[PDB]
Amino acid sequence: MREIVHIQAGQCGNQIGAKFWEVISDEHGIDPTGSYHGDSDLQLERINVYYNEAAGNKYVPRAILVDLEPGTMDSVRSGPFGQIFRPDNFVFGQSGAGNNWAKGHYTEGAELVDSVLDVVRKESESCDCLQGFQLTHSLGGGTGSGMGTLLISKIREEYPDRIMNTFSVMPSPKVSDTVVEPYNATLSVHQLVENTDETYSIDNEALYDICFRTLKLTTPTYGDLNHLVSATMSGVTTCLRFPGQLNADLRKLAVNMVPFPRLHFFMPGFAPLTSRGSQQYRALTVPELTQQMFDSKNMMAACDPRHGRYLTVAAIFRGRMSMKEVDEQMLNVQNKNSSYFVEWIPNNVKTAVCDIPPRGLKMSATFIGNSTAIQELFKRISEQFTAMFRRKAFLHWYTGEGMDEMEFTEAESNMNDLVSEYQQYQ
Amino acid sequence: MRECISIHVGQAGVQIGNACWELYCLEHGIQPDGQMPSDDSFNTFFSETGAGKHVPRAVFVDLEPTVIDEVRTGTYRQLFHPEQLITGKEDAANNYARGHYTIGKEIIDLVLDRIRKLADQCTGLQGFLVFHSFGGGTGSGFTSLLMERLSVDYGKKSKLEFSIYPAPQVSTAVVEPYNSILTTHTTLEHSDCAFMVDNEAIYDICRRNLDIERPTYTNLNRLISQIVSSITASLRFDGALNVDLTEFQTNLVPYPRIHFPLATYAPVISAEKAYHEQLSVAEITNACFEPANQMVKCDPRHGKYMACCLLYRGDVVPKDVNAAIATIKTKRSIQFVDWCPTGFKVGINYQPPTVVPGGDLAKVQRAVCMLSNTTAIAEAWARLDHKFDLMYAKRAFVHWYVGEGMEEGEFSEAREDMAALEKDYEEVGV
Ligand SMILES: CC(=O)O[C@H]1C(=O)[C@@]2(C)[C@H]([C@H](OC(=O)c3ccccc3)[C@]3(O)C[C@H](OC(=O)[C@H](O)[C@@H](NC(=O)c4ccccc4)c4ccccc4)C(C)=C1C3(C)C)[C@]1(OC(C)=O)CO[C@@H]1C[C@@H]2O
Ligand SMILES: Nc1nc2c(ncn2[C@@H]2O[C@H](COP(=O)(O)OP(=O)(O)OP(=O)(O)O)[C@@H](O)[C@H]2O)c(=O)[nH]1
Ligand SMILES: Nc1nc2c(ncn2[C@@H]2O[C@H](COP(=O)(O)OP(=O)(O)O)[C@@H](O)[C@H]2O)c(=O)[nH]1
Ligand SMILES: [Mg+2]
């Protein structure tokens, strides 16, 4: 029944993934051993969406773990929840990607993908009815960007009608740890625009802005950023795991969210978010849940939605709440902010409402925004790529892996074609 | 004898069903396990097995498991026959073409096999009661696949249809206008009386009459079931003027395509208000001609009425009803067509309206359901085809419908057929 297969690529994809498995195991009431210890029948009713049932009532997550280095597998396997994953589903090389997209796609991961894909088959054949693939990765560096988009291409060719749904941490100018992220990202966005059905664009600059200007964390780690990402990952699949007043499958999102086939790059968000020193003074009620959820400060990509228009927004609410109050607030937002929504769509907001809020919250909303402002993320990556490529800087590392300057020219061509399609509707 | 097969489709139809069957069980005194402690009044809605178990004449259909798996687990798990709660694997995704062409194409011959096994227990089947959302993928596409089959399989039998229809402002989906327009062939060709209802109108009725500031859907579904209990009451109970389900249609429907009445119910009232007013037949009759109580956001004063069925129930007497409708004929704001000098069909049933014990709505000695054919409803269509036009001019989501086996020309052919219905309701008002 609507199974998801989840796949983790590179350091970032395995880190946002290994936190996601701690979050959905808390929801489903599964112990770090793999045993169920939860309160409620509703936790166990849809455990099949993310887990395989196994002997002794142990539940093994339907995750494939992919890397070109052993050291992230060693860090996950030794971690808070590491023993829960199937030993056969850790698929890895020895020599890394070197932060090179061409090592991922053409050499080091082209060797390994035959050993990955045949595990994705064992999980997908163990499904009763697969709904889709849920892939976590980063667009900077080489493993997530270049092997993860190789793997998207292989799974897309094999499963053409299932949902391909990716969570994609991607570069920004003021929070960059690598010289060649513009190249790696530009070569990777060229694969996402053609193959994925949804891509959730996430940024470390926006995840630090939530930590500093909303949560008021003094020293936010990558573990704190991974917690913000994985809350929205748990959010969008909620309606295929729990009952609700309005159910929305990942496909019921896509049909409402994607007006034209290629405009599937989404900007996620979450509510409530508070400092731990101010949760005492807020009322969590749907109007306050809404006023935060649509705030330019709350969204997990550096694009301000006041620099564009929304095509579609989806607000996936969780908790015991009024349908009048939810339908009132999603009306009031797009009438009082009407200059920020496209006027050729007569209602821009999808709503969904689950009966089961996150453990320790009375209510939650996960926000998904499709906005013409996402062009500013692809535009800045293309403007950084352009400066390095106009002088062929660092290209012997890619052409030494058998790549061409023609593939760089074709990737940046397709990047500006994606920017032009979002700008067209602005 | 006098059976009705009740078919509940998608999330909206199933959740209205879970309120309808909550009501019918209380009204006939059937326990939620289907047993009856201590007349054939239940026979329209329940088949009786030799154990003394009353099993409902209903089919619940959804293309995804979630809502019917909740019916299979909640207090009514023992009421229904387990194979007439029908689920697929795959959601219809608010896409008409998944409901009609691609996903619902697999479940249909299992659904019709259950309807046949119900109809073969009916000794004198009166009609079908079909419950759905106009905005849903299962709601529009599966109901339109099912009705096309029922209209060749049961061509004589009356098909009454209860539709949650998109609002002026309130909406839950971007593609609600596409699914609703594609449905207009179903209601025109394969339905006999189609009761449009609106979430935004019932929310405003809840705010003004029930004093509930922020309602859920469970508050709406206890009003949509109160109307079908009032339509079917003459089939189930003794009355002064019992109305047959074809007698109803012979007075409601002036022309074959002109079968989209409004409905309203009175008194919708909070139990705290109901002590401080007397709620006489004339008060509750006049309440039905307020714009404030119409369950579609359109104004009846911008139309002409063609025919009304005032379906009274409880402590109502034919004197008081004649005296009431004589005042409705006196008022010039309530305008009828020149060609209907009679105006009113009246039904009067001796069974008071049943309170659901968890409900927002008062105990009252009297109720009326007014079902009402009026030209005004064409504005609810002229709202929604203007939502369709803005999106279809851009082809704004059409690749998801074309991608699941629909002809692109069906959008033009559905907007065309809606303009011919909106023409007919303007054309008869002269
Ligand atoms: C008493 C009280 O209100 O406690 C809250 C709390 O103080 C706040 C600050 C929590 C807290 O969040 C954080 O500390 C945090 C830090 C960095 C990044 C992200 C979160 C909380 O830790 C987080 C925790 O949330 C959960 O436990 C959810 O089930 C969540 N899962 C996890 O956080 C989790 C943690 C460890 C292991 C496994 C799961 C979740 C989110 C989305 C979907 C599914 C589950 C909650 C409500 C609280 C505390 C405990 C203080 C907040 O988080 C959530 C998701 O509600 C941060 O802002 C909100 C508002 C809350 O008021
Ligand atoms: N009153 C009422 N309205 C409902 C209820 N559930 C859904 N609706 C309305 O139904 C419309 C959307 O239809 P869906 O619930 O998505 O219909 P569906 O057939 O399940 O659609 P699919 O998921 O695509 O199969 C919205 O306008 C809702 O307001 C309910 O329980 N009561
Ligand atoms: N949020 C998050 N970002 C990370 C994490 N680790 C690395 N990153 C950041 O995102 C980029 C990810 O690249 P990486 O995953 O290391 O490349 P790969 O291993 O070759 O795929 C890095 O440059 C970091 O800025 C992590 O745990 N969480
Ligand atoms: Mg549905």
PDB file of N, CA, C and O and ligand atoms in Angstrom, chain A residues 245-247 252 323 327 350, chain B residues 9-16 62-64 67 91-95 133-140 164-167 170-173 176 179 197 199 202-203 217-218 220-221 224, ligand 2:
ATOM      1  N   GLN A 245      -8.694  14.678   7.604  1.00  0.00           N
ATOM      2  CA  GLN A 245      -9.912  15.272   7.058  1.00  0.00           C
ATOM      3  C   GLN A 245      -9.813  15.527   5.543  1.00  0.00           C
ATOM      4  O   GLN A 245     -10.820  15.448   4.846  1.00  0.00           O
ATOM      5  N   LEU A 246      -8.609  15.781   5.034  1.00  0.00           N
ATOM      6  CA  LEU A 246      -8.257  15.886   3.620  1.00  0.00           C
ATOM      7  C   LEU A 246      -6.972  15.103   3.390  1.00  0.00           C
ATOM      8  O   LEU A 246      -5.921  15.560   3.819  1.00  0.00           O
ATOM      9  N   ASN A 247      -7.021  13.968   2.703  1.00  0.00           N
ATOM     10  CA  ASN A 247      -5.827  13.196   2.398  1.00  0.00           C
ATOM     11  C   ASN A 247      -5.179  13.668   1.090  1.00  0.00           C
ATOM     12  O   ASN A 247      -5.878  13.839   0.094  1.00  0.00           O
ATOM     13  N   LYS A 252      -1.096  13.505  -5.507  1.00  0.00           N
ATOM     14  CA  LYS A 252      -2.134  14.531  -5.283  1.00  0.00           C
ATOM     15  C   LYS A 252      -1.523  15.898  -5.009  1.00  0.00           C
ATOM     16  O   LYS A 252      -2.125  16.912  -5.339  1.00  0.00           O
ATOM     17  N   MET A 323     -11.845  22.866   9.522  1.00  0.00           N
ATOM     18  CA  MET A 323     -11.761  23.077   8.086  1.00  0.00           C
ATOM     19  C   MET A 323     -12.177  24.488   7.680  1.00  0.00           C
ATOM     20  O   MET A 323     -11.565  25.035   6.777  1.00  0.00           O
ATOM     21  N   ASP A 327      -9.543  26.804   5.740  1.00  0.00           N
ATOM     22  CA  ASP A 327      -9.984  27.338   4.441  1.00  0.00           C
ATOM     23  C   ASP A 327     -10.097  28.881   4.432  1.00  0.00           C
ATOM     24  O   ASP A 327      -9.786  29.524   3.433  1.00  0.00           O
ATOM     25  N   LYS A 350      -3.295  24.635  -2.366  1.00  0.00           N
ATOM     26  CA  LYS A 350      -3.735  23.285  -1.985  1.00  0.00           C
ATOM     27  C   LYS A 350      -3.701  23.176  -0.464  1.00  0.00           C
ATOM     28  O   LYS A 350      -2.733  23.608   0.154  1.00  0.00           O
TER      29      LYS A 350
ATOM     30  N   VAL B   9     -18.807   7.562  -2.650  1.00  0.00           N
ATOM     31  CA  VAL B   9     -17.617   7.563  -3.515  1.00  0.00           C
ATOM     32  C   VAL B   9     -16.610   8.635  -3.105  1.00  0.00           C
ATOM     33  O   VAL B   9     -16.954   9.799  -2.896  1.00  0.00           O
ATOM     34  N   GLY B  10     -15.342   8.246  -3.024  1.00  0.00           N
ATOM     35  CA  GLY B  10     -14.236   9.113  -2.630  1.00  0.00           C
ATOM     36  C   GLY B  10     -14.262   9.489  -1.152  1.00  0.00           C
ATOM     37  O   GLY B  10     -15.029   8.908  -0.392  1.00  0.00           O
ATOM     38  N   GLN B  11     -13.439  10.426  -0.687  1.00  0.00           N
ATOM     39  CA  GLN B  11     -13.394  10.818   0.721  1.00  0.00           C
ATOM     40  C   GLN B  11     -14.659  11.559   1.171  1.00  0.00           C
ATOM     41  O   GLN B  11     -15.264  11.176   2.171  1.00  0.00           O
ATOM     42  N   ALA B  12     -15.115  12.558   0.424  1.00  0.00           N
ATOM     43  CA  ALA B  12     -16.331  13.304   0.719  1.00  0.00           C
ATOM     44  C   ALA B  12     -17.576  12.418   0.799  1.00  0.00           C
ATOM     45  O   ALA B  12     -18.331  12.515   1.756  1.00  0.00           O
ATOM     46  N   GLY B  13     -17.802  11.547  -0.185  1.00  0.00           N
ATOM     47  CA  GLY B  13     -18.956  10.659  -0.203  1.00  0.00           C
ATOM     48  C   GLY B  13     -18.938   9.643   0.929  1.00  0.00           C
ATOM     49  O   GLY B  13     -19.972   9.415   1.544  1.00  0.00           O
ATOM     50  N   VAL B  14     -17.781   9.052   1.227  1.00  0.00           N
ATOM     51  CA  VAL B  14     -17.591   8.118   2.342  1.00  0.00           C
ATOM     52  C   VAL B  14     -17.771   8.803   3.681  1.00  0.00           C
ATOM     53  O   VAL B  14     -18.373   8.212   4.566  1.00  0.00           O
ATOM     54  N   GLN B  15     -17.282  10.026   3.877  1.00  0.00           N
ATOM     55  CA  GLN B  15     -17.421  10.723   5.155  1.00  0.00           C
ATOM     56  C   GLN B  15     -18.827  11.291   5.378  1.00  0.00           C
ATOM     57  O   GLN B  15     -19.316  11.259   6.508  1.00  0.00           O
ATOM     58  N   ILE B  16     -19.536  11.728   4.334  1.00  0.00           N
ATOM     59  CA  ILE B  16     -20.984  11.976   4.406  1.00  0.00           C
ATOM     60  C   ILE B  16     -21.718  10.669   4.687  1.00  0.00           C
ATOM     61  O   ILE B  16     -22.616  10.644   5.511  1.00  0.00           O
ATOM     62  N   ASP B  62     -13.583   3.757  -2.659  1.00  0.00           N
ATOM     63  CA  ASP B  62     -12.485   4.699  -2.761  1.00  0.00           C
ATOM     64  C   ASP B  62     -11.324   4.042  -3.501  1.00  0.00           C
ATOM     65  O   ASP B  62     -11.130   2.835  -3.432  1.00  0.00           O
ATOM     66  N   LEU B  63     -10.548   4.800  -4.254  1.00  0.00           N
ATOM     67  CA  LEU B  63      -9.418   4.257  -4.999  1.00  0.00           C
ATOM     68  C   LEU B  63      -8.169   4.094  -4.128  1.00  0.00           C
ATOM     69  O   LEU B  63      -7.310   3.273  -4.439  1.00  0.00           O
ATOM     70  N   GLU B  64      -8.128   4.765  -2.979  1.00  0.00           N
ATOM     71  CA  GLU B  64      -7.107   4.607  -1.940  1.00  0.00           C
ATOM     72  C   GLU B  64      -7.683   4.027  -0.626  1.00  0.00           C
ATOM     73  O   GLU B  64      -8.896   4.071  -0.397  1.00  0.00           O
ATOM     74  N   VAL B  67      -9.420   6.148   4.105  1.00  0.00           N
ATOM     75  CA  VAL B  67     -10.714   6.551   4.669  1.00  0.00           C
ATOM     76  C   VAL B  67     -11.617   5.346   4.923  1.00  0.00           C
ATOM     77  O   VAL B  67     -12.249   5.268   5.967  1.00  0.00           O
ATOM     78  N   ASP B  91      -4.296   6.149  -5.037  1.00  0.00           N
ATOM     79  CA  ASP B  91      -5.040   7.406  -5.008  1.00  0.00           C
ATOM     80  C   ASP B  91      -5.283   7.955  -6.440  1.00  0.00           C
ATOM     81  O   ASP B  91      -4.472   7.761  -7.354  1.00  0.00           O
ATOM     82  N   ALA B  92      -6.426   8.608  -6.677  1.00  0.00           N
ATOM     83  CA  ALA B  92      -6.753   9.283  -7.941  1.00  0.00           C
ATOM     84  C   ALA B  92      -6.133  10.685  -8.128  1.00  0.00           C
ATOM     85  O   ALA B  92      -6.235  11.255  -9.205  1.00  0.00           O
ATOM     86  N   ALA B  93      -5.444  11.213  -7.123  1.00  0.00           N
ATOM     87  CA  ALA B  93      -4.588  12.387  -7.170  1.00  0.00           C
ATOM     88  C   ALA B  93      -5.277  13.701  -7.578  1.00  0.00           C
ATOM     89  O   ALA B  93      -4.630  14.590  -8.117  1.00  0.00           O
ATOM     90  N   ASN B  94      -6.568  13.859  -7.311  1.00  0.00           N
ATOM     91  CA  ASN B  94      -7.392  14.964  -7.779  1.00  0.00           C
ATOM     92  C   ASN B  94      -7.346  15.107  -9.299  1.00  0.00           C
ATOM     93  O   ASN B  94      -7.511  16.194  -9.837  1.00  0.00           O
ATOM     94  N   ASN B  95      -7.157  14.000 -10.004  1.00  0.00           N
ATOM     95  CA  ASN B  95      -7.097  13.944 -11.445  1.00  0.00           C
ATOM     96  C   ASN B  95      -8.290  13.124 -11.958  1.00  0.00           C
ATOM     97  O   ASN B  95      -8.323  11.910 -11.794  1.00  0.00           O
ATOM     98  N   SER B 133     -17.886  14.093  -4.144  1.00  0.00           N
ATOM     99  CA  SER B 133     -17.296  15.409  -4.361  1.00  0.00           C
ATOM    100  C   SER B 133     -17.170  15.685  -5.852  1.00  0.00           C
ATOM    101  O   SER B 133     -16.658  14.860  -6.598  1.00  0.00           O
ATOM    102  N   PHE B 134     -17.557  16.874  -6.307  1.00  0.00           N
ATOM    103  CA  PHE B 134     -17.315  17.326  -7.674  1.00  0.00           C
ATOM    104  C   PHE B 134     -15.837  17.649  -7.938  1.00  0.00           C
ATOM    105  O   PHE B 134     -15.373  17.560  -9.067  1.00  0.00           O
ATOM    106  N   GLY B 135     -15.087  18.004  -6.899  1.00  0.00           N
ATOM    107  CA  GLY B 135     -13.698  18.445  -7.005  1.00  0.00           C
ATOM    108  C   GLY B 135     -12.651  17.335  -6.958  1.00  0.00           C
ATOM    109  O   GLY B 135     -11.537  17.508  -7.440  1.00  0.00           O
ATOM    110  N   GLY B 136     -13.002  16.188  -6.399  1.00  0.00           N
ATOM    111  CA  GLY B 136     -12.136  15.019  -6.296  1.00  0.00           C
ATOM    112  C   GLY B 136     -11.813  14.323  -7.614  1.00  0.00           C
ATOM    113  O   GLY B 136     -12.585  14.400  -8.564  1.00  0.00           O
ATOM    114  N   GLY B 137     -10.718  13.575  -7.665  1.00  0.00           N
ATOM    115  CA  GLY B 137     -10.399  12.667  -8.754  1.00  0.00           C
ATOM    116  C   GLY B 137     -11.262  11.417  -8.726  1.00  0.00           C
ATOM    117  O   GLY B 137     -11.837  11.064  -9.752  1.00  0.00           O
ATOM    118  N   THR B 138     -11.434  10.775  -7.566  1.00  0.00           N
ATOM    119  CA  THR B 138     -12.386   9.673  -7.383  1.00  0.00           C
ATOM    120  C   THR B 138     -13.821  10.183  -7.432  1.00  0.00           C
ATOM    121  O   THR B 138     -14.630   9.660  -8.191  1.00  0.00           O
ATOM    122  N   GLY B 139     -14.125  11.268  -6.732  1.00  0.00           N
ATOM    123  CA  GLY B 139     -15.401  11.958  -6.758  1.00  0.00           C
ATOM    124  C   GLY B 139     -15.960  12.246  -8.148  1.00  0.00           C
ATOM    125  O   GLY B 139     -17.084  11.862  -8.441  1.00  0.00           O
ATOM    126  N   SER B 140     -15.195  12.854  -9.050  1.00  0.00           N
ATOM    127  CA  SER B 140     -15.621  13.142 -10.427  1.00  0.00           C
ATOM    128  C   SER B 140     -15.438  11.962 -11.396  1.00  0.00           C
ATOM    129  O   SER B 140     -16.371  11.526 -12.067  1.00  0.00           O
ATOM    130  N   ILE B 164     -20.977  17.509  -3.286  1.00  0.00           N
ATOM    131  CA  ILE B 164     -20.247  18.655  -2.732  1.00  0.00           C
ATOM    132  C   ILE B 164     -19.503  19.360  -3.858  1.00  0.00           C
ATOM    133  O   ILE B 164     -18.611  18.794  -4.479  1.00  0.00           O
ATOM    134  N   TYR B 165     -19.931  20.575  -4.156  1.00  0.00           N
ATOM    135  CA  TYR B 165     -19.600  21.370  -5.327  1.00  0.00           C
ATOM    136  C   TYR B 165     -18.691  22.551  -4.946  1.00  0.00           C
ATOM    137  O   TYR B 165     -18.876  23.103  -3.864  1.00  0.00           O
ATOM    138  N   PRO B 166     -17.682  22.941  -5.756  1.00  0.00           N
ATOM    139  CA  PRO B 166     -16.765  24.034  -5.415  1.00  0.00           C
ATOM    140  C   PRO B 166     -17.410  25.392  -5.106  1.00  0.00           C
ATOM    141  O   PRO B 166     -18.366  25.809  -5.756  1.00  0.00           O
ATOM    142  N   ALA B 167     -16.852  26.103  -4.128  1.00  0.00           N
ATOM    143  CA  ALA B 167     -17.372  27.367  -3.604  1.00  0.00           C
ATOM    144  C   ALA B 167     -16.910  28.619  -4.381  1.00  0.00           C
ATOM    145  O   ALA B 167     -15.983  28.543  -5.195  1.00  0.00           O
ATOM    146  N   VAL B 170     -13.746  29.658  -0.961  1.00  0.00           N
ATOM    147  CA  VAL B 170     -13.180  28.458  -0.326  1.00  0.00           C
ATOM    148  C   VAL B 170     -12.866  27.377  -1.362  1.00  0.00           C
ATOM    149  O   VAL B 170     -13.716  26.986  -2.152  1.00  0.00           O
ATOM    150  N   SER B 171     -11.653  26.839  -1.341  1.00  0.00           N
ATOM    151  CA  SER B 171     -11.246  25.725  -2.204  1.00  0.00           C
ATOM    152  C   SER B 171     -10.112  24.938  -1.558  1.00  0.00           C
ATOM    153  O   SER B 171      -9.366  25.484  -0.749  1.00  0.00           O
ATOM    154  N   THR B 172      -9.968  23.657  -1.899  1.00  0.00           N
ATOM    155  CA  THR B 172      -8.944  22.784  -1.297  1.00  0.00           C
ATOM    156  C   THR B 172      -7.895  22.315  -2.303  1.00  0.00           C
ATOM    157  O   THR B 172      -6.928  21.649  -1.936  1.00  0.00           O
ATOM    158  N   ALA B 173      -8.092  22.615  -3.583  1.00  0.00           N
ATOM    159  CA  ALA B 173      -7.327  22.118  -4.712  1.00  0.00           C
ATOM    160  C   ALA B 173      -7.211  23.206  -5.778  1.00  0.00           C
ATOM    161  O   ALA B 173      -8.044  24.094  -5.869  1.00  0.00           O
ATOM    162  N   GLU B 176      -9.751  21.716  -8.894  1.00  0.00           N
ATOM    163  CA  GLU B 176     -11.184  21.592  -8.580  1.00  0.00           C
ATOM    164  C   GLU B 176     -12.113  22.060  -9.733  1.00  0.00           C
ATOM    165  O   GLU B 176     -13.112  21.378  -9.979  1.00  0.00           O
ATOM    166  N   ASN B 179     -12.032  19.235 -12.627  1.00  0.00           N
ATOM    167  CA  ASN B 179     -12.761  18.024 -12.264  1.00  0.00           C
ATOM    168  C   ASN B 179     -14.279  18.238 -12.264  1.00  0.00           C
ATOM    169  O   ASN B 179     -15.039  17.388 -12.727  1.00  0.00           O
ATOM    170  N   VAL B 197     -24.442  20.907  -3.249  1.00  0.00           N
ATOM    171  CA  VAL B 197     -24.192  21.484  -1.928  1.00  0.00           C
ATOM    172  C   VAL B 197     -22.817  22.148  -1.938  1.00  0.00           C
ATOM    173  O   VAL B 197     -21.935  21.744  -2.678  1.00  0.00           O
ATOM    174  N   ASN B 199     -19.549  23.756   0.589  1.00  0.00           N
ATOM    175  CA  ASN B 199     -18.904  23.854   1.899  1.00  0.00           C
ATOM    176  C   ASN B 199     -18.958  25.278   2.473  1.00  0.00           C
ATOM    177  O   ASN B 199     -19.166  25.430   3.672  1.00  0.00           O
ATOM    178  N   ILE B 202     -22.609  26.090   3.898  1.00  0.00           N
ATOM    179  CA  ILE B 202     -22.835  25.382   5.152  1.00  0.00           C
ATOM    180  C   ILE B 202     -21.958  25.946   6.272  1.00  0.00           C
ATOM    181  O   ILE B 202     -22.436  26.066   7.393  1.00  0.00           O
ATOM    182  N   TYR B 203     -20.708  26.350   6.017  1.00  0.00           N
ATOM    183  CA  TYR B 203     -19.891  27.028   7.025  1.00  0.00           C
ATOM    184  C   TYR B 203     -20.539  28.322   7.516  1.00  0.00           C
ATOM    185  O   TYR B 203     -20.474  28.614   8.705  1.00  0.00           O
ATOM    186  N   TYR B 217     -15.448  19.293   9.110  1.00  0.00           N
ATOM    187  CA  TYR B 217     -16.374  18.596   8.222  1.00  0.00           C
ATOM    188  C   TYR B 217     -17.441  17.758   8.934  1.00  0.00           C
ATOM    189  O   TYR B 217     -18.526  17.605   8.385  1.00  0.00           O
ATOM    190  N   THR B 218     -17.215  17.241  10.142  1.00  0.00           N
ATOM    191  CA  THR B 218     -18.232  16.409  10.805  1.00  0.00           C
ATOM    192  C   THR B 218     -19.505  17.194  11.106  1.00  0.00           C
ATOM    193  O   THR B 218     -20.589  16.630  11.085  1.00  0.00           O
ATOM    194  N   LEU B 220     -20.725  19.568   8.995  1.00  0.00           N
ATOM    195  CA  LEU B 220     -21.387  19.699   7.694  1.00  0.00           C
ATOM    196  C   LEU B 220     -22.122  18.414   7.342  1.00  0.00           C
ATOM    197  O   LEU B 220     -23.252  18.428   6.880  1.00  0.00           O
ATOM    198  N   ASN B 221     -21.487  17.274   7.563  1.00  0.00           N
ATOM    199  CA  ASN B 221     -21.997  15.974   7.145  1.00  0.00           C
ATOM    200  C   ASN B 221     -23.249  15.553   7.933  1.00  0.00           C
ATOM    201  O   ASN B 221     -24.113  14.864   7.405  1.00  0.00           O
ATOM    202  N   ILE B 224     -25.917  17.469   5.803  1.00  0.00           N
ATOM    203  CA  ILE B 224     -26.139  16.832   4.503  1.00  0.00           C
ATOM    204  C   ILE B 224     -26.909  15.518   4.658  1.00  0.00           C
ATOM    205  O   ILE B 224     -27.752  15.201   3.830  1.00  0.00           O
TER     206      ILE B 224
HETATM  207  N1  LIG C   2     -18.609  18.424   3.804  1.00  0.00           N
HETATM  208  C1  LIG C   2     -17.556  17.729   3.451  1.00  0.00           C
HETATM  209  N2  LIG C   2     -16.853  18.114   2.411  1.00  0.00           N
HETATM  210  C2  LIG C   2     -15.740  17.312   2.169  1.00  0.00           C
HETATM  211  C3  LIG C   2     -15.398  16.265   2.978  1.00  0.00           C
HETATM  212  N3  LIG C   2     -14.230  15.690   2.524  1.00  0.00           N
HETATM  213  C4  LIG C   2     -13.909  16.383   1.442  1.00  0.00           C
HETATM  214  N4  LIG C   2     -14.799  17.402   1.180  1.00  0.00           N
HETATM  215  C5  LIG C   2     -14.723  18.316   0.037  1.00  0.00           C
HETATM  216  O1  LIG C   2     -14.295  17.560  -1.107  1.00  0.00           O
HETATM  217  C6  LIG C   2     -13.579  18.382  -2.054  1.00  0.00           C
HETATM  218  C7  LIG C   2     -12.336  17.637  -2.566  1.00  0.00           C
HETATM  219  O2  LIG C   2     -12.654  16.304  -2.935  1.00  0.00           O
HETATM  220  P1  LIG C   2     -11.695  15.086  -2.402  1.00  0.00           P
HETATM  221  O3  LIG C   2     -11.859  14.929  -0.899  1.00  0.00           O
HETATM  222  O4  LIG C   2     -10.233  15.430  -2.725  1.00  0.00           O
HETATM  223  O5  LIG C   2     -12.428  13.979  -3.267  1.00  0.00           O
HETATM  224  P2  LIG C   2     -11.751  12.567  -3.571  1.00  0.00           P
HETATM  225  O6  LIG C   2     -12.784  11.794  -4.366  1.00  0.00           O
HETATM  226  O7  LIG C   2     -11.445  11.732  -2.320  1.00  0.00           O
HETATM  227  O8  LIG C   2     -10.538  12.972  -4.512  1.00  0.00           O
HETATM  228  P3  LIG C   2      -9.340  11.999  -4.773  1.00  0.00           P
HETATM  229  O9  LIG C   2      -8.387  11.932  -3.595  1.00  0.00           O
HETATM  230  O10 LIG C   2      -8.595  12.579  -5.930  1.00  0.00           O
HETATM  231  O11 LIG C   2      -9.739  10.591  -5.108  1.00  0.00           O
HETATM  232  C8  LIG C   2     -13.211  19.659  -1.284  1.00  0.00           C
HETATM  233  O12 LIG C   2     -13.843  20.787  -1.870  1.00  0.00           O
HETATM  234  C9  LIG C   2     -13.648  19.392   0.155  1.00  0.00           C
HETATM  235  O13 LIG C   2     -14.061  20.567   0.849  1.00  0.00           O
HETATM  236  C10 LIG C   2     -16.243  15.880   4.126  1.00  0.00           C
HETATM  237  O14 LIG C   2     -16.058  14.965   4.913  1.00  0.00           O
HETATM  238  N5  LIG C   2     -17.316  16.673   4.239  1.00  0.00           N
END
